[PDB]
Design an enzyme around this catalytic site. Sequence first.
Site, PDB file in Angstrom:
ATOM      1  N   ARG A  65      11.843  12.377   0.050  1.00 31.55           N
ATOM      2  CA  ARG A  65      12.995  11.793  -0.308  1.00 31.55           C
ATOM      3  C   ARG A  65      12.759  10.555  -0.972  1.00 31.55           C
ATOM      4  O   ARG A  65      13.005  10.550  -2.289  1.00 31.55           O
ATOM      5  CB  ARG A  65      14.200  11.632   0.630  1.00 31.55           C
ATOM      6  CG  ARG A  65      15.082  12.344   1.576  1.00 31.55           C
ATOM      7  CD  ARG A  65      16.414  13.202   0.762  1.00 31.55           C
ATOM      8  NE  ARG A  65      16.118  14.117  -0.119  1.00 31.55           N
ATOM      9  CZ  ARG A  65      15.841  14.141  -1.454  1.00 31.55           C
ATOM     10  NH1 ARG A  65      15.617  13.089  -1.868  1.00 31.55           N
ATOM     11  NH2 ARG A  65      15.322  15.326  -2.019  1.00 31.55           N
ATOM     12  N   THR A  66      12.362   9.864  -0.417  1.00 31.09           N
ATOM     13  CA  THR A  66      12.041   8.531  -0.626  1.00 31.09           C
ATOM     14  C   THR A  66      11.070   8.360  -1.851  1.00 31.09           C
ATOM     15  O   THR A  66      11.137   7.583  -3.010  1.00 31.09           O
ATOM     16  CB  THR A  66      11.388   7.440   0.316  1.00 31.09           C
ATOM     17  OG1 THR A  66      12.699   7.677   1.264  1.00 31.09           O
ATOM     18  CG2 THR A  66      11.320   6.188   0.095  1.00 31.09           C
ATOM     19  N   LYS A  85     -13.755   7.667   7.759  1.00 34.84           N
ATOM     20  CA  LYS A  85     -15.050   6.762   8.013  1.00 34.84           C
ATOM     21  C   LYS A  85     -14.651   5.356   7.863  1.00 34.84           C
ATOM     22  O   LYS A  85     -14.945   4.760   7.166  1.00 34.84           O
ATOM     23  CB  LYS A  85     -16.275   7.468   7.004  1.00 34.84           C
ATOM     24  CG  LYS A  85     -15.863   7.514   5.582  1.00 34.84           C
ATOM     25  CD  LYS A  85     -16.715   8.469   4.940  1.00 34.84           C
ATOM     26  CE  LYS A  85     -18.097   7.953   4.644  1.00 34.84           C
ATOM     27  NZ  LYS A  85     -18.010   6.876   3.708  1.00 34.84           N
ATOM     28  N   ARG A 117       4.527   3.247   2.043  1.00 36.41           N
ATOM     29  CA  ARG A 117       5.247   3.662   3.018  1.00 36.41           C
ATOM     30  C   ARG A 117       4.008   3.770   4.356  1.00 36.41           C
ATOM     31  O   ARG A 117       2.950   4.012   4.105  1.00 36.41           O
ATOM     32  CB  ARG A 117       5.971   5.066   3.401  1.00 36.41           C
ATOM     33  CG  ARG A 117       6.752   5.080   4.653  1.00 36.41           C
ATOM     34  CD  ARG A 117       7.446   6.256   4.306  1.00 36.41           C
ATOM     35  NE  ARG A 117       8.707   6.112   3.781  1.00 36.41           N
ATOM     36  CZ  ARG A 117       9.790   6.006   4.591  1.00 36.41           C
ATOM     37  NH1 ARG A 117      10.036   7.075   5.595  1.00 36.41           N
ATOM     38  NH2 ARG A 117      11.163   5.552   4.121  1.00 36.41           N
ATOM     39  N   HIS A 159      12.717  -1.384   5.595  1.00 33.32           N
ATOM     40  CA  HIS A 159      12.776  -0.595   4.495  1.00 33.32           C
ATOM     41  C   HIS A 159      13.849  -1.009   3.125  1.00 33.32           C
ATOM     42  O   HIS A 159      14.916  -0.503   3.177  1.00 33.32           O
ATOM     43  CB  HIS A 159      13.563   1.037   5.000  1.00 33.32           C
ATOM     44  CG  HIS A 159      13.523   2.170   4.257  1.00 33.32           C
ATOM     45  ND1 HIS A 159      12.937   2.166   3.047  1.00 33.32           N
ATOM     46  CD2 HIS A 159      13.816   3.235   4.692  1.00 33.32           C
ATOM     47  CE1 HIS A 159      13.010   3.332   2.652  1.00 33.32           C
ATOM     48  NE2 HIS A 159      13.759   3.986   3.839  1.00 33.32           N
TER      49      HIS A 159
END
Lengths: 310, 310, 310, 310, 153, 153
Positions: free
Chosen positions: B54-55, B84, B105, B134
């Site tokens: 969605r975002t 690594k 995010r 957010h």
Amino acid sequence: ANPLYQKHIISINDLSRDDLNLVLATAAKLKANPQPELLKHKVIASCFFEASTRTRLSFETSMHRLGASVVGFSDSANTSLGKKGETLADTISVISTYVDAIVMRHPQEGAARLATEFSGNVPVLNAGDGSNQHPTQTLLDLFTIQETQGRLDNLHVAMVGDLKYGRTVHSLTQALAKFDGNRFYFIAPDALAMPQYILDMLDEKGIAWSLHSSIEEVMAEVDILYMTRVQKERLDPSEYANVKAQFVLRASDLHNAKANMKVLHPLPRVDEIATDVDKTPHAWYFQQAGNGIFARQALLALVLNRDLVL
Amino acid sequence: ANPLYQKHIISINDLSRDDLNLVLATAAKLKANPQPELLKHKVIASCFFEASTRTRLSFETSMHRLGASVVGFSDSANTSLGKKGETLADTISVISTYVDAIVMRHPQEGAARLATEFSGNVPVLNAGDGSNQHPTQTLLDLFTIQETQGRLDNLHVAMVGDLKYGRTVHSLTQALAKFDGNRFYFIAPDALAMPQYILDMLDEKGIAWSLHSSIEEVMAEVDILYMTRVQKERLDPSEYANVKAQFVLRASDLHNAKANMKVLHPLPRVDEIATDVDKTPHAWYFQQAGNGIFARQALLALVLNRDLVL
Amino acid sequence: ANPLYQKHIISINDLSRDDLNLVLATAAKLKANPQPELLKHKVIASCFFEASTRTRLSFETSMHRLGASVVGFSDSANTSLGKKGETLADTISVISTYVDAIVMRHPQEGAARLATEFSGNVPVLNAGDGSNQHPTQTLLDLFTIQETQGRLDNLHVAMVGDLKYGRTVHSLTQALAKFDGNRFYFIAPDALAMPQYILDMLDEKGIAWSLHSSIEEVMAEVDILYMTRVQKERLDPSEYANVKAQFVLRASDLHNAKANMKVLHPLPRVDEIATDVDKTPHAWYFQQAGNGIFARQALLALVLNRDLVL
Amino acid sequence: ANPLYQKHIISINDLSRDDLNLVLATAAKLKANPQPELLKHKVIASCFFEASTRTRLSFETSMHRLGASVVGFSDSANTSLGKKGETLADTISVISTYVDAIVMRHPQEGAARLATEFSGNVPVLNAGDGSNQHPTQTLLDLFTIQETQGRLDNLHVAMVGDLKYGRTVHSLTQALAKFDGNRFYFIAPDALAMPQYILDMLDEKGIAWSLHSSIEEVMAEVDILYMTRVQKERLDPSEYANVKAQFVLRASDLHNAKANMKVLHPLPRVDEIATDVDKTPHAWYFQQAGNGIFARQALLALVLNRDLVL
Amino acid sequence: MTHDNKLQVEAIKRGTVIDHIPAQIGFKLLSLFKLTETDQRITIGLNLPSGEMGRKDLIKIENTFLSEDQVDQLALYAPQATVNRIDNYEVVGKSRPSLPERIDNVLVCPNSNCISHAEPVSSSFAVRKRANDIALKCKYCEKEFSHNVVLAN
Amino acid sequence: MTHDNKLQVEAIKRGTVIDHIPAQIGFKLLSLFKLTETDQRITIGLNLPSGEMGRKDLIKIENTFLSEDQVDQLALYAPQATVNRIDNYEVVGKSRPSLPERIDNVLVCPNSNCISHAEPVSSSFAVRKRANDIALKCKYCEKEFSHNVVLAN
Ligand SMILES: Nc1ccn([C@@H]2O[C@H](COP(=O)(O)OP(=O)(O)OP(=O)(O)O)[C@@H](O)[C@H]2O)c(=O)n1
Ligand SMILES: Nc1ccn([C@@H]2O[C@H](COP(=O)(O)OP(=O)(O)OP(=O)(O)O)[C@@H](O)[C@H]2O)c(=O)n1
Ligand SMILES: [Zn+2]
Ligand SMILES: [Zn+2]
């Protein structure tokens, strides 16, 4: 038309000195005056059959900075091709039916050169094939040596780390051997030694190299110190750990380094270069990765473009 | 230069009233006359280390609608970085070497603000960090309140659902507290109560709030009804199920709602708002998600652009 | 025959004070005078549809210690039965023609009671069923309380941790409430508190209870300290850390305890009980797990044998 | 009681020449005159935190062949214990109140010795612990060397393959060096060679050894050929293939071997020993795996029984 | 002179003397603030008699003037400590610790999911005296915790 | 009681004086061996002006006598220190450390697959081969490393 026009960049071994200098002189112009619509209307495929984020984000930004569209997949996250027996000869014969160049990484050595037999006239640029080649990492390494040292010859280049399985050190030694009077110092655990066929090629060209087991032995003379990732699976826990995890650079070691010395590292670096080295002016590993943008842009320009007006 | 120029949008707590109104006045102009080539030649990274479709689709469409190129990865589908031992300080120090802004995010709280210490001059806009912030969800929520109610002050805002772990209600309460005379009604299961530190902040600013256990108690007075997802893992099966799954909105409940009342929901909604509510004129949750396009476009415009000609 | 002969052991709620005492009486005889060929020629099925290595090994060792044979399984993302297609009811209908008794642990509540209606005259014993019941844990806790304290009545018992969802604490209060004059101290984070139903039951029988916030507040009157693990996935990581100077136990806290005060924990114990508690005389959780053998030996002997004159 | 009665069997380093001979002596009696109700009423735990079907079945069959009962597990991506939260130390502390002896195999080195400090008087036997130790493999190799050759002294023994990381070859040299006059031939790829510590130990005792590059070079003096599998993941696929005309064994190579020369391999054998070796008289790896039963029967009988007059 | 006192305490000529370190915090402060990573003469005394205000610890650090900022971070630990500078054999300044703005470096975020745990970052918490206690807010995760929850961890 | 000063600070009554600590080993020894976890007065002199080493550290713990093996746990770190045992203002005993046969607790196995890391066990190393340079073998994984390697982390 320029010599690289519509050429497949698959191995360092196929690029001459003149080829290497052309790419490098073009990267320097694109770094100085950008050309954001040079590949306008071109669509390039970015096929990473094996994932490699670092390389992919840099190749694709390079394509975005000359104005091209990108379509493509990252995998080892089942984006379904190779499904129901599909050969690579057949995947590439369908992809070349509608894109203007293919960039590709694949786990088996030889895969980019096979793509070449099926692509027709669409160039194939190799972003890595198994433990064989990775031209675009050597082109950016070279560009960064040239830009910081002013030359690609008469260098004192030390290579440190796992020299036996590190695919980038093996190619850069081969590229630098194209040039004159460079001198090599290899500093590696005995189990991760530079292979004989590299050493044999250096000998046969009269190029000088030597083995040392401490960077302290060679710091004073060193222009480029190309460090490498030792992966702890190449040794056992206790081996890595033992008297061998001291191919690690700290800030104090650089005390006597020449004013011009630079520390290069393909990345990711986990602990072979300590974090305090970053504040030194010799730390050029991030700047090196930034230079990946102009070395990849120049190759895409020279390959897709007949005459490049500079 | 405008105040947000080259600023990192990491927390709501760092944006003033004036900042919030600037973004919101710019979203309104871009919604009215679009500027499809304003970020022409900019390349932005869309790093979703934790997937959120969605975002991501909304941030990237926003970047496409101002003319910018996008490169990047969605993960929790092993697109190989963090592999690594690669630190986030090192990932961001290499990504900022070639993109003009980073949207990101990440599952750990604090990650976007650490990206800030390594990005140099490339802005970092946070699309979510763990259970912390957010901003871009609060900016779109605000924009939708403003656009439907005409103001952001003197509102009667009810918040319904899981108020204890819902990251968006906690930020919107903090943003609305920036403004004047808003009044809060919180309606939550006792186990999913609005935290004390929110309530303590409301008290210390003289803002009025109250607790009710039925929406029916407050419908008449309500301007914005911000509903939330209760996730059934936050309670056990029998708890969710019991006398607590009646923080659910149906069409009949809206009978006495003011003509101006709107139902907002960050989404996905699974069953807290019944499908018959969609046909009402008070259902504004999809329109809310459409407004995410102009709130994100305005932030990208103000951050990458010195002077914005409006 | 004995009261429990051929009976299903599905819930503590279903066993009277006298049944619990008979089990506890037998388990003390079997501890003292082993009878290793008591269930010779019996085959029990250890059907763990939900894996629990600790419960499974205690039970199978119980089975073997009385000489019975064992066929069975544990299923984490593997091995066929219950499939989705195959009903639990048909699994049981089929396994109940192969064996003499069924011990089973399943993820959904009441799986054991469903089994009862399909096993013919084959007894089924519940080793856990979702968040509902675990009879043989409560039987070994009461055996350990009776064996250390000398009685199951007039005890000052403190239950600590996640009282809302510890299934063993719900059970142990039900059971300790068939006896007389017990006093309960419930020390829990108010988000994780004993449900009103245990409490409401306790008031009908007139049992004394109190809620405290620190073990420190009752260390001095307490005979049993029953610690439960607090489940970090039902909490927020920062909620979890910010509570008092916690509700975990260390030897320092014990300087106050009565000489016969004992600390019980169903295990696993990650951090609510530190390693220095293990060396005090009050530490009784490993002996508690050893008594699991004698409590489940007793239940199996009573169910499968008519008269037991041991 | 017997020397090993109630003792922990964790490392070859810990057992004297006399202890190794006593085990070998017992294992020959148990092979000849079976005693199937020797451990009647004993329950052993087969805790394989690391799966190894071949070792696990040999041990459980040993257990059953002496009449003991077995509870246990193997865990590849499944079943609860050791969890991460649950310590190994608490797993053992709990399992050591249920059983009479613990056989365990774990991925980290020294897991067995850690267990020893938590099992009370319950003996623990190591079935492998990372790259450190595997006593019961060395016991069955020496049993097979003694049973085929007639002695454990004055042997010409050749060890082949991955000598750097074959844990059984490190052990077998330690053990064969408590006896007298043995001569060792180590034929390995120099990247995979016997570590300086085995070698340095061997020089202190004055044992004769030599390093060769082909089995062909010693086929004629050799009494035991002990083949080890070469681990292709620690090599490069092209390294792996380009070595001599390899170090694998075929019947052709054997036309030279002494009549009592035998070929041993701990198994699995993928390709270092071809199928035509299986039909010669020198093939002894399957008989070797059968003697695993008698070596582990002996160890279990000596540990759990005080005096054994068989 | 004699009511034992000092046993003619090492009057340093110039430097910082930290006194009334509350007992047991003395060693904490050396570790945390890395006061021993200096080549200058330190003389430390632990579990000294403070017939006056407890029992105490005391670090005398020579030719060193720890100041201002440096003095305030010690507030969370030895709230009751007086720092005294010396320029020529007696007290030139005597300063008490006042609670600072921020506490960097020394302190760990309680929040196991905070990014600070895994990364090359230096802790930073914002101090706020919620009269009854001091709450500390992490720069990164922005979660606020009692100073006592953070001081154990 | 008798004279102190600081060029060579002085006289505690009855207790131990570990003197001629290399320099910058003093605080390591305090930390590692937790000598601080005592209620007795401790006096410590760091970077002190002295006889042949020039600048050394010193620790005086009164009312505690440590020896025989405690003195030996100091040999890897402070091999050339002396441990004066004092009763009634006179050094009634003077020890030097010697390499022990086992160093419990203080070291960390460099082998990352060792089990010791994760668990309620104290580390332990068998020690060997005096001054040509020491090898340490973990009790648990039985890997032998060079002391300098265990001693770097
Ligand atoms: N050249 C000097 C002068 C003073 N000091 C120390 O500096 C501290 C200052 O305390 P002072 O003002 O001299 O008298 P006090 O009453 O001890 O100060 P306070 O009120 O803090 O107790 C004392 O510990 C003293 O040893 C010192 O070591 N060297
Ligand atoms: N009551 C006393 C007596 C002696 N010392 C300390 O004891 C240590 C050494 O004892 P001593 O034999 O008296 O002086 P040295 O001859 O220097 O001893 P060595 O040569 O072994 O260092 C000195 O550091 C001194 O400070 C002390 O602090 N308190
Ligand atoms: Zn934090
Ligand atoms: Zn170890």
